[PDB]
Amino acid sequence: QVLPTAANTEASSHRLGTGVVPALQAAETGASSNASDKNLIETRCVLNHHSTQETAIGNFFSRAGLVSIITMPDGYVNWDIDLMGYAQLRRKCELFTYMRFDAEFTFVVAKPNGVLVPQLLQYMYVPPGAPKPTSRDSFAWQTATNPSVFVKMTDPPAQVSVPFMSPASAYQWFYDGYPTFDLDYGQCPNNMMGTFSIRTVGTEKSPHSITLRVYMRIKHVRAWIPRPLRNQPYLFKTNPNYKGNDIKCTSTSRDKITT
Amino acid sequence: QVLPTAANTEASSHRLGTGVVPALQAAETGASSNASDKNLIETRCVLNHHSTQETAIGNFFSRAGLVSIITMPDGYVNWDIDLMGYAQLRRKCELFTYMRFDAEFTFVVAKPNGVLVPQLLQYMYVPPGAPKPTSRDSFAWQTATNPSVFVKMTDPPAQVSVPFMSPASAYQWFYDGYPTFDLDYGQCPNNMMGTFSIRTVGTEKSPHSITLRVYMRIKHVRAWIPRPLRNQPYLFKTNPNYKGNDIKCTSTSRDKITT
Amino acid sequence: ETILEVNNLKTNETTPMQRLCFPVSVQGELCAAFRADPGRDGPWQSTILGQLCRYYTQWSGSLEVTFMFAGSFMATGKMLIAYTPPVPADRITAMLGTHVIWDFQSSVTLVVPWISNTHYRAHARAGYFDYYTTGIITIWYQTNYVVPIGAPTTAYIVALAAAQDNFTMKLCKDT
Amino acid sequence: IPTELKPGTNQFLTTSAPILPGFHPTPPIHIPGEVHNLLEICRVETILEVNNLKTNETTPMQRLCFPVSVQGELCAAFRADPGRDGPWQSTILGQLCRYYTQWSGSLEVTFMFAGSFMATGKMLIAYTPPVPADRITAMLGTHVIWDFQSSVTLVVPWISNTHYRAHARAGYFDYYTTGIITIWYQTNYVVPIGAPTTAYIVALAAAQDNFTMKLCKDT
């Protein structure tokens, strides 16, 4: 059903009788009560036009966020592709279990102190099983088939679009089981989407340190089976392990229950 | 009613009679006199085509103006969002009481001496209640949900559009009362629209001072209940307090009333 | 509907399992009281509704609070649940505001109507934002908790909170 | 797709991508007293500060009116240009006109007697196009005979060599002047015994229907 706006409130009056009772409910059945405000108090007729577009999953998720930072103090680094490295986004996408979406990436590159220097960089996306470069002049940099991006540092940040590349129907943030017939537990093969590598094009030694920031935007998202959020700080990038001593309470405590 | 042009002047002649008198009026009733020029002197028929588009509120207000200046001689500053910091615009928007509009912002960034140096900056808009960053490398900079803007100094000034974000129907420049059940007086909660924070992206210490200038443009404005202007210099950024000794006269004085 | 952490006592930090409900014994005084704003830190923080509302700045709509008795079958009594718009001192001064008489199927569904000077309300705090408060919820003993012999003299009541149909949110923010 | 850059790019002018992609503003409500045109404020009558004497600086309350006593001489005189500094500065019409450079249209000046009921007399109000010396030489120009309901409404017709006039000052802009307004005693201010011998007259100024402005400026 379509609900462009929240339901209006109808007029009501006092009620006195036997048998009918909307106030009493049955929470043991596990169903939220369907009692409306018009069934307990006298309410005037109020028409509301509060739209619900801002609460759609697409608008809620359509916000770029930092996913990882890369520093280049040999001239190249091969960074594995993962999106669970920062809480600010991990908590957001971990509320659901399975989501199918479309990712858009943006790369911001600058020196450690933020100064900009003319320098040419190259980015390659290595699918799983593809050869992995091991040197600034490795033969794997010929990018015969793998996609490549070339951009100068002074140029505006690059923007690319990545389709949904999982073998399964949708990504899964949890895998209760083993992929093979203890650290292995919880590793879903359907999430390893290859790695990422950056380098300086010149065969010489670059004289400036390189820092890259990657922001991921989402679109055409579709969620399934929402799960409760997380109220404990993360400890690892793969499993929900937590500090077993300082169990943080969900709600801040007070002095007395009567006040 | 629509009045694209000012009313034309009709022809007239001399009048001599009793009972009818347009010259006499009644200012005690508080209504401006409705006497037309044709009712006191003989006037030729003059047709005018002076348009009144330039006197519309939209054209009168559609002019960007400086709202604040920010200097960065720790590498970040959290500046509270307020528009009553400069008389040139405060007098303009303080003529009305309630206005609903749409704001457009433009940021100009340069060194104190006006020189331009390649440097990358980041701006975040922090809504009220959102976490406030406290360091150049604070975790709040991950901008999971808050909007962000990234731009180099040498790049053209950034332009963004901000919708009307007040809980009430329109902004109020005056609040005669208290928000809670002496310095508190005059503080309307419906005006605090969060704060503003800027920083240098690099985790190092930036070697150049940063000065930012913010200009605000307005559009789709709608005013209500105009109020008299202000003829005294401002003393504070929150209340209309004034110097109680040097009461500046509205009109410049002269020597003698007969000359 | 999700569980509400009413009993957020200081001594309950080490044993959070007892922070999900409050006791009812044999005594007309009050048993518990808390603010009803889902945004401010407190009991509403444990609810998924409050957790989601932390991601937004402005919200509007009525709220519903449902209670569930967990005592013995032979136990009986009447409890009064009252909501006070912008803290009461006793039953007669708390009965003026909106209230619901509850008797021990046992699931009372208190509804918090939406009354505010503004169309959209913001999360409350200390300062100017105090003007955006919503009210105080309190519960009182209508009659004493009567129990027969050979039965427990103490019972626990859980609190469940949810949102009504006319709820809405805007101005997404990051916490 | 081919394109060619043009002069004037990257030029920020004081006269846009959105940041929130799903915001729905709070619904508007009916508020009485909405202004759609700034010209509406100009069409309202406001007090005129005629008595801008030097000694009145410390006591501004007496600067809003001028006295009338028992004497045919003159009582007050001032320029009629709303832009130039002077009596017109206190009017909201002049204050708004400070924000614009060119204006055109006729003006209306309304007076109000505040003396005792038994007081009576006749006063002459005259407007002189581009200062008179006496009544007979001031009667040549446009004038209105006023007798003591007591609210006379002098109208200043729009006579100018140009369609749009600019604010006057000293220098070349003197050519944009508009004229001099003066008032004279038609008959003496007659009062009976046991009554005050002095009365005060307030001055109210406003703009006519055919007013217009252009070339917005910042003061």
Add this chain to the structure above:
Amino acid sequence: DRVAQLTIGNSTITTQEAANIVIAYGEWPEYCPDTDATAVDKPTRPDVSVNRFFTLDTKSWAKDSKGWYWKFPDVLTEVGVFGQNAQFHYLYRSGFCVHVQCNASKFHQGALLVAVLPEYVLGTATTQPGQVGAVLTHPYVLDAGIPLSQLTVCPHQWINLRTNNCATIIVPYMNTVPFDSALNHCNFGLLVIPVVPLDFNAGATSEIPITVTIAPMCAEFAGLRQAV
């Protein structure tokens, strides 16, 4: 029929075990008609504000209690918007819906007779007890020389701990004049007398509360005095 709910005004009362609703003399409360009105001033009808259910104090039932009674509308004279309104007027007309709640365990025993006696007059200050309500001294004669055995002729509902725990009475405005003051007359009184004393074995919930909840139905007022 065992369950019922009444949601008059901004309040609501629910009961999972209650008897039927007793309407006094079969006349629903209603506003004054034009053919019967004698006042010439336009009356005021606060409506929702004055129909909020008001809960009075709690009386503690004991094993040897005699009884308690209340005088109307002196109970509501000093509480709520009704109190602040009746103190500012001179003419008053409204009905009343009386609710009495007293619940005990399944092992207690005892009976109560909730009966509203219209225009109760006492005999040998205490005439208008107020919100607190006074107790009886000679319940057999009701301190008025009439036998309690014939008190059932008035509208009443029985509260027997075996079956029910609460009872309701809806009594309309009964008076020989269409309007009447609120500080010099009492329309009716309520009687609660334990015919069967409460008995239970040792080791039960000794504290047993009694609560009375009332709410005006069709309130109207006239005349504007200063402060009385």
Add this chain to the structure above:
Amino acid sequence: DRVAQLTIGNSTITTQEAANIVIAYGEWPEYCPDTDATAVDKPTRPDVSVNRFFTLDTKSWAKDSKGWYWKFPDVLTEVGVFGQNAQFHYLYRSGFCVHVQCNASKFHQGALLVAVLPEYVLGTATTQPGQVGAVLTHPYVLDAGIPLSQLTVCPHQWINLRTNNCATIIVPYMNTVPFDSALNHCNFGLLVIPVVPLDFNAGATSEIPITVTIAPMCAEFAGLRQAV
């Protein structure tokens, strides 16, 4: 047109010599419409009770007075059924009809500027004077840094002893929110400043009173607090 009579509520005001009636911004006061209401609770409309004209204290005009002002609805917060009602609620919406009367003999002279400034904010307790009303200190700038010469842009009526003795203003409810409290906000204020000082020969009625009479028009309320 010189004579008029207003009979709102159980009161009546007549004047044998008065000017015309000035309606603020040309909007008659009216009840809140459903399309604009945001409250979900049924409001209360006392109607006749709260529309009785209320007369405040009397200010003595002197030959060297500066001026007086009042804050609304703080003046009515502590008087009458309106006071006892607003102290029991949380939401408030009504218009106002302001009447100011000051009559002198045919030989006195002086002028007054009765003007209602919506949402008056003061500058450098006294913010809410109450029924008594406070006096001004710097009338030229109204203690707010704005010139009095432009105060006529607000709805106003002139009281000139030569012609009239009283003036009326009918201002509707103006606020950015359909409902608003009554103890934490002030909708508007009233200004009375003598532009022309009172002058008279010795041997006249030196005592000259000034009286302000006000009355709510379309009062409505919502929410039921305890006591504030």
Add this chain to the structure above:
Amino acid sequence: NSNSASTTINYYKDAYAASAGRQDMSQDPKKFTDPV
């Protein structure tokens, strides 16, 4: 989606990101000057 404060050129999805065109030319004379 329609979301604006109140013949305009818009290049984005939101309605509050646009440039105001020829402003409306309409005034109510009597309302302010002569409200009697």
Add this chain to the structure above:
Amino acid sequence: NSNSASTTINYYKDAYAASAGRQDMSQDPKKFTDPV
């Protein structure tokens, strides 16, 4: 070619390179609250 995860502006041949427009406004009340 049609290839997307799920009134939009597209400038390329692929269908997964586009900007989402006005999101769909549709919810199923009973499914989560009252699945009995």
